[PDB]
Amino acid sequence: AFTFAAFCYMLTLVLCASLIFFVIWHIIAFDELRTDARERLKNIERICCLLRKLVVPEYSIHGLFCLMFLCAAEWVTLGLNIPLLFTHLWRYFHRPADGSESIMNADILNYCQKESWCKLAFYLLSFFYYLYSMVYTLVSF
Amino acid sequence: LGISIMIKKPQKSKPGVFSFLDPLAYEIWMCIVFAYIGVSVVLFLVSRFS
Amino acid sequence: WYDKGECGAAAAASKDKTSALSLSNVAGVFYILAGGLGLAMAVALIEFCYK
Amino acid sequence: IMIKKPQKSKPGVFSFLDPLAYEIWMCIVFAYIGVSVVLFLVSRFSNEFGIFNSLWFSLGAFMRQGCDISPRSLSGRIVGGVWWFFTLIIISSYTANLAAFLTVERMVSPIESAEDLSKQTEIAYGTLDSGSTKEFFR
Amino acid sequence: VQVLLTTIGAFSAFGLMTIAISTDYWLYTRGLTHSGLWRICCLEGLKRGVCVKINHFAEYLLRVVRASSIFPILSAILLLLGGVCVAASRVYKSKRNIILGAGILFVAAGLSNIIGVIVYISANAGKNHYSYGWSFYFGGLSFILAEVIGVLAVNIYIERSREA
Ligand SMILES: O=c1[nH]c2cc(C(F)(F)F)c(N3CCOCC3)cc2n(CP(=O)(O)O)c1=O
Ligand SMILES: Oc1nc2ccc(-c3c(Cl)cccc3OC(F)(F)F)cc2[nH]1
Ligand SMILES: CCCCCCCCCCCC
Ligand SMILES: CCCCCCCCCC
Ligand SMILES: CCCCCCCC
Secondary structure: OOOHHHHHHHHHHHHHHHHHHHHHHHHHHHHHHHOOOHHHHHHHHHHHHHHHHHHHHHHHHHHHHHHHHHHHOOHHHHHHHHHHHHHHOOOOOOOOOOOOOOOOOOHHHHHHHHHHHHHHHHHHHHHHHHHHHHHHHHHOO | OOOOOOOOOOOOOOOOOOHHHOOOOHHHHHHHHHHHHHHHHHHHHHHOOO | OOOOOOOOOOOOOOOOOOOOEOOOOOHHHHHHHHHHHHHHHHHHHHHHHHO | OOOOOOOOOOOOOOOOOOOEOHHHHHHHHHHHHHHHHHHHHHHHHOOOOOHHHHHHHHHHHHOOOOOOOOOOOOHHHHHHHHHHHHHHHHHHHHHHHHHHHHHOOOOOOOOOOHHHHHHHOOOOOOOOOOOHHHHOOO | OOHHHHHHHHHHHHHHHHHHHHOOOOEEEOOOEEOOOOEEOOOOOOOOOOOEEOOOOOOHHHHHHHHOOHHHHHHHHHHHHHHHHHHHHHOOOOOOOHHHHHHHHHHHHHHHHHHHHHHHHHHHOOOOOOEEOOHHHHHHHHHHHHHHHHHHHHHHHHHHHHOO
């Protein structure tokens, strides 16, 4: 019983591994940042460039997930994925600098730690939900 | 009423998962794979002579 | 005849399938493609963890 | 029940996508957009192949037109090979089914029985004014 | 390092391609008869055990080539020659061309093998359902092993020619 919704769930299953790897790298980069002459600077600009270039794909791919679900008519899952898209739309993010960070070695580091851990938990839970949905739609044949 | 036909109901006859391979027999696909490996190795060998 | 039919009248209304290729004919190539992307993403992480 | 004998209609626009069902077309679109993004991610784990250039490569490979560049890594090459196989099968399927459409034509009656005629209600059905065939329905 | 791997590959491939042709479990078909390349044998019938040969009578060329199963025989010969050439490279070393000769023998073996199976499968069909045994898959595994040891032999030759 192959169906468009089934294929979209399968494709999301493939992409969610990359979506997880991004947040794992973000966690490692934060842990490298927290434990700290110009060498420390060059380290902090390297990490800032890494984060700035890694932010956008993590948002665009989730945009694909929500778009695929909207266009495939799966609303119970699009409802799950809407709040994260809204947070990814810089709703809580202020307007200070284009990048996430000025070393900003302060409570901002703890906030980014907490939100990164939360994002990883959400990603893995959503991954397992996608796997279950795919198996349910296919095996039901 | 009247005398009427009676035939077995035609099943849905769902296609196989890998039904796209039918237009060519199993032997043709596997010999395609094996000729691919053979051609790759021969092209490599001929390319390299020192 | 009908109102007590054991087989019932499921899909009693005429249903004529179209002659277009349905997704059930070519589902195999979609399974292959999604599997290929999954394998590519396994190899592309093994290489990076190697370095 | 009397209806006009069904003849072939005037072929509407957007008929070129009849040989493949709508679900297949949607799956093709999203498979292309999935393959391109995966090829991008692969080429940016370990070659240019940014998103804008990877989308062009995938679209070029689907339309059978020669690719400008080719992946060099292994994981970038598995994706290329799989998408090549997929596009070959899909184009062969489209051409073959279109040939079937053009070769032998099947005409289907829009309406089969009176129950479906009541359900449809898109076609207007009328009796004679006054008579048994009219007074029966009252 | 790699010469030993080429030797073990050469003799394993020769062993598999001389077990493939001699034994008779190629094709399973109908009572169920586990066929072979030379001899057909019966199973689950009035007769069992002992068994009889095949009868093979310009399609005559196909019949004679399938009958006198030359191409697998030649594949076995070529694999053996490649094995002895790799053996003779260790002694009388620095010949620089015996190893390339081995690299060509181990590839001509693959080509003769694939002709052998194309001919066998083409003649076989000359409805009923059939299946393939383990002699067939020893042949198929010998082909793969032959091609791989061929590429390893050329790799060794190139490395040893660049070292000079
Ligand atoms: O006894 C009757 N016998 C009838 C026989 C016929 C027919 F068989 F067709 F000749 C018809 N027609 C129906 C349409 O085609 C032309 C005329 C009407 C009949 N009517 C009138 P009703 O009551 O309106 O059916 C009668 O009364
Ligand atoms: O001597 C031999 N050469 C061979 C080449 C291929 C095969 C084979 C295998 Cl290994 C698996 C499935 C089908 C096969 O035959 C095919 F032609 F491909 F259909 C067997 C062979 N034996
Ligand atoms: C009926 C004749 C039997 C011939 C079989 C001899 C071939 C065995 C393998 C030879 C390879 C060296
Ligand atoms: C019957 C399954 C084997 C088909 C293999 C198709 C791959 C051919 C491309 C090299
Ligand atoms: C360098 C060894 C070759 C391994 C793969 C070759 C397959 C024909």
